Symmetry: D2
């Protein structure tokens, strides 16, 4: 039977005997994602160019506004906003959402794939909502995932039931379930990181990547791919297997990607698909945050590959 995101979350909710509030959140989020997709594919650009005589800000406003009006959220953390946004009392629900509304957009002038990353927590205390409600370890996530605006638009939704992938049919504005309960390969053949900054690599990263290009045995060297857009690179990692690295170094001892709305959601998707996500010292999902914009190193992907990285990493520690 055909299945849409709307029908899927309703049915997972009836199984869980839920009240429907998380489904309202996700419905509102999907509406925002269709609106972002439409703007990212440049619907209406002819009007900007005078036929009748910003993008990351618009994406942020869409997500912010749909979530606030969902009546399901109370604290909203965005990559685009210095402080957490506190939902006004009359619209407050029980969930905390951290999101990157248009990840990768700094290079959107070249039409690179971009995406929306999100992580959904249940508010844990009864105190007045504040930034501290978003300072939960990724282990506490209720749901997380991303929309990828690539050759097509796809929503990847990870929850306790696993990882499910929904293709946006723009003819009708429906997310169609096309990949159910997806699992990542145990071991891949692609490595993904910015090798231009090799001079700053931690010595363990240098050795691990050397082994991918120059295997000490008779295996074939890994292929290299690096889009420079986290959603594109992580989704390829999910589909094809392999490893994605944005690691710490001496100049950036905490990495550069942001824990709350980049690393944790991707780490959660990965673990629900049978993959791994490490900072090098611990699981990303076990980091207890102290700053809503704090950075974390991340190495994620096929478990055999992540474990091999950790072997080399331990060797230099």
């Amino acid at each position: 039977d055909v299945n849409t995101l709307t029908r899927f979350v309703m049915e997972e909710g009836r199984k869980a005997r839920g009240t429907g509030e998380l489904t309202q959140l996700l419905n509102s989020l999907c509406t925002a994602v269709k609106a972002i997709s439409s703007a990212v594919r440049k619907a209406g650009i002819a009007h900007l160019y005078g036929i009748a005589g910003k993008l990351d800000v618009l994406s942020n406003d869409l997500v912010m506004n749909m979530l606030k009006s969902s009546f399901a959220t109370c604290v909203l953390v965005s990559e685009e906003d210095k402080h957490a946004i506190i939902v006004e009392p009359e619209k407050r629900g029980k969930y905390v959402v951290c999101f990157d509304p248009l990840d990768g957009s700094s290079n959107i002038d070249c039409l690179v794939s971009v995406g929306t990353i999100f992580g959904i927590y249940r508010k844990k205390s009864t105190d007045e909502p504040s930034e501290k409600d978003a300072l939960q370890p990724g282990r506490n996530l209720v749901a997380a995932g991303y929309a990828l605006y690539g050759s097509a638009t796809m929503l990847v939704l990870a929850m306790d039931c696993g990882v499910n992938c929904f293709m946006l049919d723009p003819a009708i504005g429906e997310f169609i379930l096309v990949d159910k309960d997806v699992k990542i390969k145990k071991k891949g053949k692609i490595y993904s990181l910015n090798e231009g900054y090799a001079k700053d690599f931690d010595p363990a990263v240098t050795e691990y990547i050397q082994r991918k290009k120059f295997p000490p045995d008779n295996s074939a060297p890994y292929g290299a791919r690096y889009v420079g857009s986290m959603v594109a690179d992580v989704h390829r990692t999910l589909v094809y297997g392999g490893i994605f690295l944005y690691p710490a170094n001496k100049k950036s001892p905490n990495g550069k990607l942001r824990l709350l709305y980049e690393c944790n959601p991707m780490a959660y998707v990965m673990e629900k698909a049978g993959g791994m996500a490490t900072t090098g010292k611990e699981a990303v999902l076990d980091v207890i945050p102290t700053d809503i914009h704090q950075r974390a190193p991340v190495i994620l992907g096929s478990p055999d590959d992540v474990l091999e990285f950790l072997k080399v990493y331990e060797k230099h520690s």
Copy 2:
């Protein structure tokens, strides 16, 4: 004033006193590209999954083939998807030869990587009966070339004698809107792009060149690295931001991997019309004289300062 692809080529043709045949070709191609874009973004995918109770690269080929045949502007069509050249039936024969890659990069489309359509347009040069040999022209002979990139948005980049112009597809109205006129690439960039997974097979010149990007001998900042693995995406980034793109020969591909007629030549032509460069290492891509419609070529292309720097390293290794 607002300008569309349709209006633009018609006006360039009136300037040149043309008969309208190349405009008919380009109109037909743009119709195919909009249909390809629609299918690549998965419009109607719900019907495949049973809402009411062809593979993309095949459909893309059919769209380009059929639109070009019915344009009455072409006589020989070479496609990545077809082993032999397609000879247009006599009643629909026009004067142009088109080599194209209908959905470049589609082998990884299952991860939604950017994909694209690449095309190069020649005038048929011989008076012989149309045949595969009509497509064996060096890229220097191109009349027009370019690509559609199906990325975060769909864009058509069209290079001609007048320069390079970029048109954004507005899917609300099915129009390509002129958004970047007479585009020129930066003289020098800060990004290098190649599959470093083949580092073990690199010839010494490539190895040294890449070492210079990571460990600059003048202690300037290292280049950043980007490699989508989809040629249209990487070349378009190279055009927009500058830098250098490399697909050199390796042990799996001793004659390079990218295809001369419908990947390297069209991108080389766009690059040169934008003030960039494109070389095999031994000569300009556009100067290679093809002998086989699917033959491969090594390619190094992008900002002129960067390609020239590579060629100095190449000369150093003779």
Copy 3:
């Protein structure tokens, strides 16, 4: 604050402490309407004409399949099907749906407005579901409405809480609430019927139309509009006021429109909007059907206008 059909029905259901089954039905119905709208506006028609080298049937297939897979329905009556469709046991829910999947399509070759009409009943008996479960008076409706595929696509949904109008935004595939708790004008200035059958009119209709052209109280004559597509004519009646008539004639002594899936849904929308709908002898919603395809005369619209017709009708007994 912005509101979608998805969010609206979900929020009405949470207010009512519902189990979500009617929402699943209405969500499935909205998906089908968007796919019908896409096909009616001829998205993809270029493929039929060979770019790469039925409409009422498709609409019926879209509604049947989405409702079956909603797990909310048990009996389905369609204009297109001789007998009621009984949902297979594993997909059975508690609701009965009568619908006209593409009303007006007989004239779609001239691109007349067309529409989808639906009425939703709860199954009342514990017996195995059967065609007889749809033989309920319109008084028993739980929800009803229509999608109009006109200059734009609009879904009008009537329930106990009133009538709400949602515009389909085709850029994002969302029904946006644009008219809340709609009420029809007490009296309009437009009458709508096929005057081509004047030779067959009952004397009461003849006299009423005479009053519209030659007003006895010195008011201006009514304008006449008759699209010939019931959804288009009824929606204008809702928006501008006035009266719509499809009375009996010699070709159709019981009228021409079908009680279960044309007259009843429109009568229910009208009454929920403060309007009226009568056969001449009784309220449409009070007719107790004995055949799922039975016909009924219908006079509906602004209450002052219908009452004036009934005043003339009673004069002729």
Copy 4:
């Protein structure tokens, strides 16, 4: 073989050995029509209702047609239903054609989602004088091309030229007008009549008798059906496809009718005649009226030729 509006006009132009200027006009017009269609179907309406935290359609449509036509380099004088005076195209963008158009005909009732449309008629500038409003004061006989876009259940462009009438369906997935009906001809006699009978008390006696004949046929034939959308493009297009008659006639309160000659009556009369139909004011062919004011009204009775002739017989009978 598939044929699009753009491909069709290029090929008609190469046949005529034309310079392409009219094709540029028609291309620009098609771009505006696709943009009108998008706005009419309410693409983006969610932004008006606060999804992220504004011209009326008839204003937007006029702006779209005006701007696309000016930038076509193919026009010199532009007459719009929306503008009191003709627009004179600036010298650097002047071409040889005069365009009269109604950018969103029927829009006054668009709040009920009635079918609406865009109507256009294209003239060659005949004089060597400086371009002025007078260049639009040509009889419909002089039309080079005319037609309409109907935004109904689907969007269709009907284009009438010397070669006949052709119908192109807009495929909104790709923004292409696809040729679906070639060389269209109207039925010789129809079975539908179309006019606002609510104003019957003001009818001219010939109209009263003709409509009486449609409802109470004197020869035991079947009475005609009645249809009246109230949007001219929708009613005229149904008339083209199914046959019959459409009436917006003069009366004593409105001796010149209500519809506008230059950008409503003339283009529809031209489409009808190119399809083998008729269009009359009652006293003469619409296309033969010589206008003196760009916004002047004309009565119009059009459609299947036997039906129109029957009307004219009734009209002549009442002198």
